[PDB]
């Protein structure tokens, strides 16, 4: 059936998962597990950026605006990435990591601390929710874009260019949504809700890292910590 342009293009702008696992997995080789995961996160964050750099209207923007956009949505993109991977993982007993690993919820239930434990379960509630709505790649992809440009226009230099990117994305989703998912429920508005949820997790996730930081647990050259401070 008829798919919006923005969704088609954006779908070509997506990298190979195996390539990601390849890229992320190889970059690792150079407590113990903790440090690895921090590095794995940082790496998925960089990969999340090359996605941005190679992005459409985002690249045509000034560097001053690119910085600020990412500085505002880096956390949501990450969490959302972790989230969608579970939409494809399907399971409810364990979480799937960008590497390829599997971690049972029983394992984090006993090992993780109050906060992470908490956050991880909250993230999974959002995974069931998005599964019910039947989230697909076309929307998934469209949604990431939307998260990238979800900022107040009073914070950018290139005013108009962004306002066009935002309205473009929302109308694209509404189209694809009312069109292909003609079942009952307003998926366009419903999905938008899942996104404000993501934004809530993002903040909690930032509070965790910050906790780790204060406690001097995070790696030294950690990228995430570099974003947390701004």
């Amino acid at each position: 059936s008829n798919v919006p342009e923005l969704m088609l293009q954006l779908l070509q702008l997506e990298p190979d998962e195996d390539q990601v696992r390849a890229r992320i997995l190889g970059c690792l080789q150079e407590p113990a597990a903790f440090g690895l995961l921090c590095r794995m996160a940082d790496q998925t964050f960089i990969s999340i950026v090359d996605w941005a750099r190679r992005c459409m209207v985002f690249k045509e923007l000034e560097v001053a605006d690119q910085m600020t956009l990412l500085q505002n949505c880096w956390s949501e993109l990450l969490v959302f990435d972790h989230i969608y991977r579970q939409v494809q993982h399907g399971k409810e007993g364990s979480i799937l990591l960008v590497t390829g690993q599997e971690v049972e919820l029983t394992t984090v239930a006993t090992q993780a601390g109050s906060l992470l434990h908490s956050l991880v379960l909250r993230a999974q509630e959002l995974v069931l929710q998005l599964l019910a709505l039947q989230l697909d790649r076309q929307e998934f992809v469209c949604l990431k874009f939307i998260i990238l440009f979800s900022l107040d226009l009073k914070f950018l230099n290139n005013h108009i260019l962004v306002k066009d990117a935002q309205e473009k994305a929302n109308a694209a989703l509404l189209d694809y949504t009312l069109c292909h998912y003609p079942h009952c429920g307003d998926k366009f508005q419903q999905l938008l809700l899942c996104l404000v949820e993501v934004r809530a997790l993002s903040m909690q996730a930032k509070e965790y890292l910050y906790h780790k930081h204060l406690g001097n647990e995070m790696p030294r050259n950690n990228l995430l910590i570099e974003m947390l401070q701004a």
């Binding site: 960089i46 950026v49 750099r53 560097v63 690119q66 910085m67 990412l70 500085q71 990228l223 570099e226 974003m227 701004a230």
Partner: peptide
Amino acid sequence: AQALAALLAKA
């Protein structure tokens, strides 16, 4: 930023 300014489009 560093990892963003220097790392974004510098390479």
